[PDB]
Design a protein around this ligand. Structure first.
Ligand SMILES: Nc1ncnc2c1ncn2[C@@H]1O[C@H](COP(=O)(O)OP(=O)(O)NP(=O)(O)O)[C@@H](O)[C@H]1O
Ligand SMILES: [Ca+2]
Ligand SMILES: [Mg+2]
Ligand SMILES: [Mg+2]
Lengths: 777, 153, 142
């Protein structure tokens, strides 16, 4: 079973000479970590020679990093490594990436560093070559993984979940798909409910996604598709619950960025019959609500895809009517983004504004009347002015694009809902991630709140793989990130932001800002005031805070409204009852007339999310953004690493595993009494007087609480200054004695000298000596 | 505490110092620690600075009865054992072979701990008759036995 | 010893003018102002009380020999120095030895040093102890 279609899926040298402690990794500035062969020592400073650059430099011995040998290179599973450290992880992958593999594993973590070009890895042939294959045989592929989740759903009999994450333009969204696309090729009988589900993308991706400075296809909603099954076979059904679409986009497009794909694909002229159904001139160009930034996405065809959208939309079992009834609503925004004014009245060209009427089925004139400055209930009316009016128009634009998106999805769930016997499900999540920008307020907070919650489920499953060597290495040990829930809580707990933006909401900005600081502020480790870390192109905030990714400075400006939408009641009421089904439905009076602030639903939506995740045997996938250039094959060290910093490698509160073989060359100095004997330390341990719940001696390794292994370094430090200065004092004494004899002799000699002399100076003052000398002729 | 014949092992060597300061019945705190070395000891300068002791020459001088509580205090002082002097020179042996080049060795004690004047280091080597190979490395293991195993063996 | 007492002898002719063979008060102060300056009266007498017994060559030779006693030999001096000329230069640094005698030891005193070096053989900084010795007591030279 090898090498037919394995060209970019899964020998060479064994040997070119590697040495042992002579070779290692060194911090480069361009390549992150560059390879080197050492030359000499001098304390902290270490002289080492760069391998294939060939020129030497100074280096602290604590930046130097261990490196693995050859037959251990371009490794399938990094868990099976000697040096799973920074400069090693960043290597292996690079080696594999640059070599046509994108997928790799590290413990129970998936690694696909995004290849910006298309790839043959997806052929049914391959798919076939996969299902039923145990993990350790076939080279690394999302397939292998996607498979074993069912391999596992059946036999173990429970739901599994598959969380696919990484940064933006990483590949989350692009695999989530490839995934349902796989599961698909295992069911058929003897355009297909299978082929119907596959289409649910082009729909939601059309309306939902958008081109971002980063990635031309960035999502804007949290997705979590569930895929159930029958007691036996292929699927029984599936469903979709989305999370927090960007409402903002609809009206504003950050420069060099655009609005949702559909909008632009609506003016491409694929089916001109509709130009007239749309009352729209097919030029993307000078419409407003959708062109603040690029209007063209290169290597992305608006007609072809749109057609594909229409085409798909049908297989969804959407009537010709339902089909149209969407485009329609969608076009109406293009137009309202137009309704001029001049005043509290001036509706310049009530000629376009004329137009929204035919589309919703509400006389436009009735509508421009009833809410240019028209009224509300208690009903009364009061002068709507030239600006909110403008800022009340988008109130309507967005306040719908959401009700519409909502509907669309809610409707897809309807045709994907066969009610056959359902037993288990493979839930796939394709959600956001943590983001820190030069400005982060509210929208940009929940992405974070939702993730924090996602970290609990993360290490929830680590404490667990952790007790997987409390079994492996015979030891029973008896918070470790107990402030994390002190963040979770800080935010979601009852006397918190949420419990308030919801509660304290005579509401203006500081009425709201005051409670916050006064209550769990001033005094919390996490919830603290701001300062300047110099965010660069960076700007304005009011509060700071810590997340398992670091901190991020927030603002609170106009949120009590930000958590809501000002659909001017009667505009609504008027829209409420109109003739266009979708429209009329999208604005129905309640169960009955005579609720929502964005979180009541999200906290609700989210809570629900979690609940189910814990009802599943998760599987983690990790998406790495090779580089900033959208170019395949390129590697941007400084970025890759940034990413590895918070997912599967160091920077949370657990025991510091350590092999004896190391504990020796390490702290052996804190207890100098021994003679091998792997027990060379049990002694150092006691030979220190340590309170030991604080540690556990497993077999080939040792586990300490936090700051334990920390103090050892702090002691080992202060311990060797002494031990050196001691041996220095020794040398010093050996000197003062190497010469004492010498000294004492002289002490004599001098006594001779300043004695005879002190007399040869009396002899010449003795009356008689003079006289004698007076005469020796 | 020390014995009477010991209170003598102190009268005898201080009558050499009261000498080289001038027979007056006093000596200079600066020279203190030095005397304490002649008496088979190796206190640390930080130490001698506790027991009275003085930085630069001529600052404060002392007679026997004060120069006494010195020795004794500086007597109950921590000294080093062979291990210490090896379980600490190991953190500089990368080959683990048991060598430390001279260029380094110098730095070790000339740059770390209670730094040593290049001078001392030059003599202390002359005396201990040290030497390096063609690789320029030295077998420190020994060196620590010579210096530990005193002047005249 | 030899010439030493014979030298000391040939000297007695000298001192004694009456050549009575005894050196009286009125017998000293004379040859005194005969070779330079004379003493004081009492000085004279105070010089005769030092002659417990009256004045002859053997009571003379006595009080004299009664001094160059508690003094070391010569090579024991021409060597006591040597202990500080480690490299055998047969000379010391005039600020060295000098440093010695006044700051450390049996503290000489200025008056003492001044009077000590007032005629010491210093060359370009180098105090020649070999001869400061060879003469502190009397070199062999002829
Ligand atoms: N294996 C892959 N092969 C080819 N192209 C890919 C692959 N993974 C991702 N891409 C490309 O990279 C782009 C980024 O994917 P995308 O789904 O937009 O990222 P993301 O992680 O979901 N970010 P966002 O949706 O903005 O939160 C895709 O639209 C494709 O252009
Ligand atoms: Ca003295
Ligand atoms: Mg996406
Ligand atoms: Mg006479």
């Amino acid at each position: 079973f090898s090498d037919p279609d394995f060209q970019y899926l899964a020998m060479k040298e064994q040997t070119a000479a590697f040495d042992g402690k002579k070779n290692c990794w060194v911090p480069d500035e361009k390549e992150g970590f560059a390879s080197a062969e050492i030359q000499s020592s001098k304390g902290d400073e270490i002289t080492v020679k760069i391998v294939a650059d060939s020129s030497t430099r100074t280096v602290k011995k604590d930046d130097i990093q261990s490196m693995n040998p050859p037959k251990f290179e371009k490794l399938e599973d990094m868990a099976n490594m000697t040096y799973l450290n920074e400069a090693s992880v960043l290597y292996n992958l690079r080696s594999r990436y640059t070599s046509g593999l994108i997928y790799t594993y590290s413990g129970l973590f998936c690694i696909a560093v995004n290849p910006y070009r298309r790839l043959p890895i997806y052929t049914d042939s391959v798919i076939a070559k996969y299902r039923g294959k145990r993990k350790t045989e076939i080279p690394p592929h999302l397939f292998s993984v996607a498979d074993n989740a069912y391999q596992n759903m059946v036999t173990d009999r429970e739901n599994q979940s598959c969380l696919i994450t990484g940064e933006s333009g990483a590949g989350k969204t692009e695999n989530t798909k490839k995934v349902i696309m796989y599961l698909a090729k295992v069911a058929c009988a003897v355009g297909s409910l299978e082929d119907q589900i596959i289409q649910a993308n082009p729909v939601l991706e059309a309306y939902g996604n958008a081109k971002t400075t980063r990635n031309n296809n960035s999502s804007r909603f949290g997705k979590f598709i569930r895929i159930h099954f029958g007691p036996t076979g292929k699927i029984a059904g599936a469903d979709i619950e989305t999370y927090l679409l960007e409402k903002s986009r609809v009206t504003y497009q950050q420069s060099a960025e655009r609005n949702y794909h559909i909008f632009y694909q609506i003016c491409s002229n694929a089916i001109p019959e509709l130009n007239d159904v749309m009352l729209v001139t097919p030029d993307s160009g000078l419409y407003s609500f959708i062109n603040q930034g690029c209007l063209t996405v290169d290597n992305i065809d608006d007609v072809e895809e749109f057609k594909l959208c229409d085409e798909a939309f049908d297989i969804l079992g959407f009537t010709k009517e339902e089909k149209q009834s969407m485009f329609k609503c969608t076009a109406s925004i293009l137009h309202m983004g137009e309704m001029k004014f001049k005043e509290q009245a001036e509706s310049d060209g009530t000629a376009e504004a004329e137009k929204v009427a035919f589309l919703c089925g509400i006389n436009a004139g009735d509508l421009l009347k009833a809410l240019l400055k028209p009224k509300v209930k208690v009903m009364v009316t009061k002068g709507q002015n030239m600006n909110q009016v403008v800022n009340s128009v988008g109130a309507l634009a967005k306040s719908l694009y959401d009700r519409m998106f909502n509907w669309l999805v809610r409707r897809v769930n309807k045709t994907l809902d066969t009610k056959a016997k359902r037993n288990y499900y493979i839930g796939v999540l394709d959600i956001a991630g943590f983001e820190i920008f030069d400005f982060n307020s509210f929208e940009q907070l929940c992405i974070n709140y939702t993730n924090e919650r996602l970290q609990q489920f993360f290490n929830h499953h680590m404490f667990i793989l952790e007790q997987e060597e409390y079994k492996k290495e015979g030891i029973a040990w008896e918070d470790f990130g107990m402030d994390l829930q002190m963040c979770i809580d800080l935010i979601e707990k009852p006397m918190g932001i949420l419990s308030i933006l919801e509660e304290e909401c005579k509401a203006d900005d500081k009425s709201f800002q005051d409670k916050l600081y006064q209550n769990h502020m001033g005094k919390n480790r996490m919830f603290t005031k701001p300062g300047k870390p110099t965010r660069p192109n960076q700007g304005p905030a009011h509060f700071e805070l810590h997340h398992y990714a670091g901190n991020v400075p927030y603002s609170i400006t106009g949120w009590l409204e930000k958590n809501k939408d000002p659909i001017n009641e009667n505009v609504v009421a008027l829209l409420g009852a109109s003739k266009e089904p979708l429209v009329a439905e999208l604005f129905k009076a309640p169960e009955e007339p005579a609720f929502q602030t964005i979180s009541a639903v999200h906290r609700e939506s989210l809570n629900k999310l979690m609940k189910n995740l814990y009802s599943t045997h998760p599987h983690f996938v990790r998406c790495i953004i090779p580089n900033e250039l959208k170019q395949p094959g390129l590697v941007d060290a400084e970025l890759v690493l940034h990413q590895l910093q918070c997912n599967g490698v160091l920077e949370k509160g657990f025991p510091s595993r350590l092999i004896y073989s190391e504990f020796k060359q390490r702290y052996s100095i804190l207890a100098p009494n021994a003679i091998d004997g792997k027990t060379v330390s049990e002694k150092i341990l006691a030979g220190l007087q340590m309170d030991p719940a604080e540690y556990r001696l497993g077999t080939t390794k040792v586990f300490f609480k936090a700051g334990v292994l920390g103090n050892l370094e702090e002691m080992r430090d202060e311990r060797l200054s002494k031990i050196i200065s001691m041996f220095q004092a020794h040398i010093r004494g050996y000197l003062i004695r190497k010469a004492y004899k010498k000294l004492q002799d002289q002490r004599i000699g001098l006594s001779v000298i300043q004695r005879n002399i002190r007399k040869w100076l009396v002899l010449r003052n003795w009356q008689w000596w003079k006289l004698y000398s007076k005469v020796k002729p | 505490k020390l014995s009477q014949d010991e209170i003598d092992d102190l009268k005898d060597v201080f009558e050499l110092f009261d000498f080289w300061d001038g027979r007056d019945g006093a000596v200079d705190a600066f020279k203190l620690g030095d005397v304490c070395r002649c008496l088979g000891i190796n206190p640390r300068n930080e130490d001698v600075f506790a027991v009275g002791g003085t930085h630069k020459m001529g600052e404060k001088s002392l007679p026997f009865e004060e120069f006494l509580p010195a020795y004794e205090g500086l007597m109950d002082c921590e000294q080093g054992t062979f291990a210490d002097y090896m379980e600490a020179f190991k953190t500089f042996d990368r080959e683990g072979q048991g060598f430390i080049s001279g260029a380094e060795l110098r730095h070790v004690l000339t740059a770390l701990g209670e730094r040593l004047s290049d001078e001392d280091v030059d003599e202390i080597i002359k005396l201990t008759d040290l030497q390096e190979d063609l690789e320029g490395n030295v077998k420190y293991e020994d060196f620590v036995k010579k210096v530990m195993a005193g002047p005249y063996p | 010893p030899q010439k030493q007492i014979q030298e000391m002898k040939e000297a007695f002719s000298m001192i004694d003018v009456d050549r009575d063979g005894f050196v009286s008060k009125e017998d000293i102060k004379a040859i005194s102002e005969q070779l330079g300056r004379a003493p004081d009266d009492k000085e004279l007498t105070a010089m005769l009380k030092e002659a417990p017994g009256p004045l002859n060559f053997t009571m003379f030779l006595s009080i004299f020999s009664d001094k160059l006693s508690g003094t070391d030999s010569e090579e024991t001096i021409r060597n006591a120095f040597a202990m500080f000329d480690e490299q055998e230069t047969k000379k010391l640094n005039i600020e060295y030895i000098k440093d010695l005698l006044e700051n450390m030891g049996d503290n000489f005193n200025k008056d003492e040093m001044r009077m000590t070096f007032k005629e010491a053989p210093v060359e370009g900084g180098k105090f020649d102890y070999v001869k400061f010795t060879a003469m502190i007591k009397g070199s062999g030279e002829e």
